[PDB]
Structures are given as structure tokens and as C-alpha cells.
Design a protein around this ligand. Structure first.
Ligand SMILES: Nc1ccc2cc3ccc(N)cc3nc2c1
Ligand SMILES: Nc1ccc2cc3ccc(N)cc3nc2c1
Ligand code: NI
Ligand code: NI
Lengths: 173, 171
């Protein structure tokens, strides 16, 4: 263990990615942005994948916090659809650097097998909140659809339509 | 007209093997055995290169709908029919599936590609939206992406009856 030097490094990885993107993520630049010695970076994350895996892992940590601040998601007395659409609305609107950053790391799992189990983590922990309410097959669905709705906004560059989102989300539950 | 195309076919090859990282104007010119930089005459920025590559790769899907008239048939189980064309694409060699996705998902942070990624989004829409309901039309594309990435990113097999269920719930 060496939490802080390690922790500073991860934060700088996230900072480097959001700024220059996955392409601008090397040990020298993380070392620089973290302002720690190059050897400390190669010591804690031998490979770049290790570093990305830890970064994404941390980005996921934040979704949980968001679910924690919005009790309606756990209140089996509230409209899951309308409530989810809303949270997404808030996440999507309000600095895409955080959004793009997290998504870039996540989508990176497509080619880098290392990131797949950490990608799967996100999903298994998100359907968790939906599976705790509805059945498991509807959870697996929601997590999937929900992803496609964000991607549809982030990729096509067409604004987020909360009502549409709530309707399509409703068709699954 | 045939040099632009040779440069394109090349980029699709570069990505299929080195991913988007390997696409470098010189990597393409090298792959298409064309004068270095000659690629710049047709595509100024790398962004232009990718937009053309994505626009050409994105056509695969239109073809498969053609070879499966059963999807244009208003009186046919779209869900199961779709769940099928999807299992075919996700079950045989992912290099095609991967390179197309990488280019498409690249839109994420390269505004250039947004319009292309959106083109294909309505194409697929109307190409099976006109089957009434505007909503179902745009939600179809999103549910497809989700169903796909859920496979491609977590490294868990494509469950067809599951896809069908989800699709059936949408339609
Ligand atoms: N790949 C994804 C998909 C959906 C997401 C929805 C979110 C909502 C709130 C938040 N704070 C972070 C989120 N991250 C996501 C990452
Ligand atoms: N972004 C996407 C989403 C779904 C897709 C489904 C497909 C099915 C057959 C095929 N030949 C190409 C496809 N491309 C896709 C690209
Ligand atoms: Ni070759
Ligand atoms: Ni077929």
C-alpha cells in the first residue's frame, strides 16, 4: 500500500483523459499531471490497462453516490422510469467532460479485454438497483436500453428528451 | 473516383487490425500502397478519413436487411427476425463488428462523426420505423446499441431469446 501517491496518480489519470483523451494517457503524462515521479507511476500500474482499469473503477464509484442522493430510486413507491430519466437528464446536462471521460474509458473495453470485467462491474451494479425492484430479466434489459439512450445523445449530438426516455424506459419495466 | 475509394478500403483495413490508434494518414497511405500524403488530397483531416470509413462500413447493415426480406415484411415477427440478424453478426468473427463500432463510438468526442453516427441512426430507424410509431423507431436503434455493447463490452455471450424479449417489449 501507498494510497496517496497511488490515489493522486489515478486522479491525474482521470484528469489527463478528460483533457487529452485516452490517446494522451501515458506514464509520463500521468506522472506529470500527478506531479509524482515517473517510477511511482510504473510501480503502481505496471501496464496502461491497470491504470485505466483503476480510473474507470473510480468513475463508477460516483454513480453509486448519485443513486444515494436520490432516494426515489430505492423507494419502491416511485416511478422507476420517470425517476431514472430524470437522473440521466441531470448527468447528461452539466459538463460533458465528466460524461465523455467516463464513457471513453468504458467504451474502451471493446478492444481492451482488461477493461471488460470492470465494465461488467458497472452494469452488474446498476441493474442491481433495478433488479432489487423488478425481476432480473427486466433489469438486464433496462441497463442495456438505458445505455443506448445516453449513447444516442452523446453520439448523434441530438439533445436529451426526458419524456421520450421515460416512455421507452416504461416499455421495459 | 477510384483513388478516394482505395484510400477508404485501406482505412477500414488499418482499423480492423490496429484499431483507430493505428489510423495515421501514413498508415493508410501505406496500406493502400499510395503516395504518402496523396491521401491528404481527398481527405484533409483524419476526421474526414474516419467519416468516409464510417459511412462505408455503416452500409453493411442495410445489405443484411435486403438479404432478409423477412424484416421488411409488415406481417412478420420483427423482434425474432431482428434478434436473428443480430446473432449472425455477433457470432462470426468480431473484427467486422469491432471496427465498425470503434468508428461509430469514436463520435463520442469527435464532433465530425456525430452527423454520420446520426445518419445511420435514422436510416435503421425508418428502414423499420415506417412500420408505424415514431417513438419505437428511435428507441429501436438505442435498444440495439445497448443489446450489442452489453455483449461486446462485458464479454458475455449474445442471448438471442433475451434480445428477442427485450425487442418484443419495445415493439
Ligand atoms: N456508461 C454509463 C451509462 C449510463 C450512466 C448514467 C449515469 C448517471 C449518473 C452518474 N453520476 C453517472 C452515470 N454514468 C453512466 C455511465
Ligand atoms: N452501431 C450498430 C448497432 C447495431 C448493429 C447491428 C448490425 C447488424 C448487422 C450488420 N451487418 C451490421 C450491424 N451494425 C450495427 C451497428
Ligand atoms: Ni495487408
Ligand atoms: Ni441471415
Amino acid at each position: 500500500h501507498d494510497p496517496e501517491r497511488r490515489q493522486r496518480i489515478i486522479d491525474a489519470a482521470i484528469r489527463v483523459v478528460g483533457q487529452k483523451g485516452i490517446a494522451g494517457l501515458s506514464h509520463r503524462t500521468v506522472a506529470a499531471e500527478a506531479d509524482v515521479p515517473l517510477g511511482s507511476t510504473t510501480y503502481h500500474f505496471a501496464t496502461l490497462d491497470d491504470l485505466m482499469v483503476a480510473a474507470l473503477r473510480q468513475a463508477n464509484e460516483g454513480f453509486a453516490r448519485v443513486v444515494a442522493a436520490h432516494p426515489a430510486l430505492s423507494d419502491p413507491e416511485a416511478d422507476l422510469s420517470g425517476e431514472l430519466a430524470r437522473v440521466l437528464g441531470e448527468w447528461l446536462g452539466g459538463d460533458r467532460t465528466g460524461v465523455e471521460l467516463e464513457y471513453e474509458l468504458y467504451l474502451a473495453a471493446l478492444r481492451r479485454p482488461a477493461l471488460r470485467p470492470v465494465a461488467a462491474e458497472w452494469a452488474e451494479g446498476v441493474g442491481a438497483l433495478l433488479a432489487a425492484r423488478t425481476d432480473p430479466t427486466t433489469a438486464r434489459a433496462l441497463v442495456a436500453v438505458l445505455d443506448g439512450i445516453c449513447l444516442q445523445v452523446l453520439l448523434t449530438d441530438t439533445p436529451y428528451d426526458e419524456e421520450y426516455a421515460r416512455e421507452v424506459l416504461t416499455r421495459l419495466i
